[PDB]
Design a protein around this ligand. Sequence first.
Ligand SMILES: O=C(O)CCc1c[nH]c2ccccc12
Length: 121
Amino acid sequence: SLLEFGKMILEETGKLAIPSYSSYGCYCGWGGKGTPKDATDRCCFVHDCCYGNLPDCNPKSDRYKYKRVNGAIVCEKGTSCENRICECDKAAAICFRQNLNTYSKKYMLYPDFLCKGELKC
Ligand SMILES: O=C(O)CCc1c[nH]c2ccccc12
């Protein structure tokens, strides 16, 4: 659920999910359309696509368990939806960490009309 995902993001990047990643670019937050603005926005796009492969799961509210093995994120065994949701979130948190150097505040609160284009998962 968003509770685990937010904690994962803070641990990984030092930034608070909200406000740092809830209104960033075209895909971090709201849903999504257009071309990702940058690497961090692409992390969100892929994350949305990852959730997209789990039609009968509920990523935002279904809670899962995960632990840290010397920094490494390890998803603990739960239901099948929980396992897959955790893997999607783990991937995004790492992607965010990997692109911290290019994170740009000019993409915070990015306006909707500037998200033009096509990008299928
Ligand atoms: O409801 C969600 O779509 C947006 C609010 C939200 C809570 N925790 C988050 C962690 C990362 C990105 C967005 C969020």
